[PDB]
Design a binder for these strands. Structure first.
Ligand SMILES: [Mg+2]
Ligand SMILES: [Mg+2]
Ligand SMILES: [Mg+2]
Length: 78
RNA sequence: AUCGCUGUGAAGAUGCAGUGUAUCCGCGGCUAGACGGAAAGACCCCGUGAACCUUUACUGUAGCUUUGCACUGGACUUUG
């Protein structure tokens, strides 16, 4: 149904069309901005931003390298 | 123009039949009768009458409750 935008799911893809439940798309993916409903209205806009999709995937996974080095420090004092 | 008796009679007679009694008209009393007056009997039966109650009469329903399909998702699992 929808066109995916994230790859940190457990059965997600890059841009493959998936047939998911109506409750899982209405409630969770779309109101956060992780998917987009496929339709034949603005198809000229998604094909032009395909070069911008590969640059957005090299930033979310690159920020995790400078993030996990401060979470496992175990310096929290209760 | 409103007496008694004994019989008759839609079967308990002031009015019929037979026979005895009795001048015309008040007032004060008493209630035996006029199946006295009041109330289309309430008892009793009837009407393919009417109500309100009862239950284990019949047909249903409020309410309560079981399970499908919606709202409604992922992650692993046992099993057909
Ligand atoms: Mg007589
Ligand atoms: Mg008379
Ligand atoms: Mg009567």
């Amino acid at each position: 149904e929808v066109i995916l935008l994230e790859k940190v799911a457990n059965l997600g893809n890059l841009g493959d069309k998936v047939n998911i439940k109506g409750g899982y798309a209405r409630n969770f993916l779309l109101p956060q901005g992780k998917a987009t409903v496929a339709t034949a209205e603005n198809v000229a806009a998604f094909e032009a931003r395909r070069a911008e999709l590969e640059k957005a995937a090299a930033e979310k996974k690159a920020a995790a390298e400078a993030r996990a080095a401060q979470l496992s420090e175990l310096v929290v004092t209760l």
